[PDB]
Design a protein around this ligand. Sequence first.
Ligand SMILES: Oc1ccc(-c2nn(Cc3ccccc3)c3c(C(F)(F)F)cccc23)c(O)c1
Ligand SMILES: Oc1ccc(-c2nn(Cc3ccccc3)c3c(C(F)(F)F)cccc23)c(O)c1
Lengths: 241, 234
Amino acid sequence: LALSLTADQMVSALLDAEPPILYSEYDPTRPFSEASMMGLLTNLADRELVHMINWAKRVPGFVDLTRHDQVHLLECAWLEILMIGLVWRSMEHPGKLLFAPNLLLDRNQGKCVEGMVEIFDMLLATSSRFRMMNLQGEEFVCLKSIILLNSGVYTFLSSTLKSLEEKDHIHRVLDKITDTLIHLMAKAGLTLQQQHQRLAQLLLILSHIRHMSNKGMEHLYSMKCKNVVPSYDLLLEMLDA
Amino acid sequence: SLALSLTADQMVSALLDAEPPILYSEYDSMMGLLTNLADRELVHMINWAKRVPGFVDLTRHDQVHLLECAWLEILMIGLVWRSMEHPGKLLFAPNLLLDRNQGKCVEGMVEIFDMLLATSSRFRMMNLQGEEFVCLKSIILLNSGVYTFLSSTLKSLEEKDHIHRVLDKITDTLIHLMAKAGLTLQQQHQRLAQLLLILSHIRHMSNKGMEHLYSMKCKNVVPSYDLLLEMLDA
Ligand SMILES: Oc1ccc(-c2nn(Cc3ccccc3)c3c(C(F)(F)F)cccc23)c(O)c1
Ligand SMILES: Oc1ccc(-c2nn(Cc3ccccc3)c3c(C(F)(F)F)cccc23)c(O)c1
């Protein structure tokens, strides 16, 4: 079971579970309009969702949960997960966001609402921060898994002993991933003080990622397209192998 | 910088000393009550903020931005802390204690109500301490708005460095409190993580709250940049 993994075993499992990088729809009309870019981003996200499920199922401890809880975590976290992926990819492209290898955008290219440019600006900042911190791949997979387990946990609520067990199991897996992060940092040769400071610096960034997702989710719901937001039923369907 | 020299004990002492008082609701409609209470709390929050070590080292403009971004999170975490010992209830004030069902009469707040309850219950199961609480609140103040400063000028860059250094000092403080309490090294890193991860959820609740204010046509109750600037300048 997941709770028995060593730090080295957890890292290996997470790295192996990594999803592929997808391309955006090839050769779209350029310049973009507000709708056309959204069409590209939405299509891309839709295609990544499938791979995210595959990834999620390989996150140690995820499948120990009921299907309902597995769906609830994905519901709450999908955009955060996509965004941290985006920020990781964009690290060595200052001033730009690498949504896909064939879709590298600066803050002016894509046509966007001014609410969108704020989010874009926030994504860029986060990416620079990771660049500055010299974030490592092994740390990234830990953070992405933390987002998956953490984002929807406080809203299980609640009662039943089983509901409590589920929450308890999530927190224990979270603890193991924390252990893993620290193990990586110590292994790298950071002092105890630097280890504890870096951990905190990384986790605090997650709150910003939650903010960006909240803002993005907000915009998504204001689109009279009745969908790019995956439903509970859709996510559940996708979960059944 | 003065802040950068503080020990863990001094940091805690300063923070405990800066705590605002717990205010009473004057009239014990939900929007009417939150508004009356929040308006009076804001005044105390500004003065609490100016007492957080490192905060007044920032430009007046940067202080306003931090508060602008953090204000609802700070109100909300105060509420969660106050409600900690009241399972199933939110203690908006000593004379305003609400359960989930009175939280239904209040329209689209039921979900936010539930999230708040869930956070308070998390605090309860963690045995969150007053000393840890004041650290968390300070972290929210310095962290929520730091990524949207605008960089550019040398000053804004120097401002961000300073914020990050103070945050590191608060991390040190938290760890010290835990070691002092007898936690093993492992338990210290774990609890640190658990505490900080709750902040993602507080941000989430603040965002839903804002979302709800706008849909309620209550955009007006939000402290504006200029309002905050004038309160600080006092
Ligand atoms: O791998 C991926 C795939 C898609 C996204 C992505 N980010 N944003 C926010 C955003 C995107 C562009 C410009 C401004 C904000 C999105 C929005 C949106 F509606 F939230 F914007 C809608 C659909 C997808 C995205 C991503 O971050 C990573
Ligand atoms: O000590 C406290 C603790 C909580 C609140 C608070 N304000 N708001 C929005 C709000 C309403 C009116 C005026 C200002 C803010 C809240 C909402 C929300 F869903 F309504 F946002 C939901 C739950 C709590 C609050 C508070 O104001 C003070």
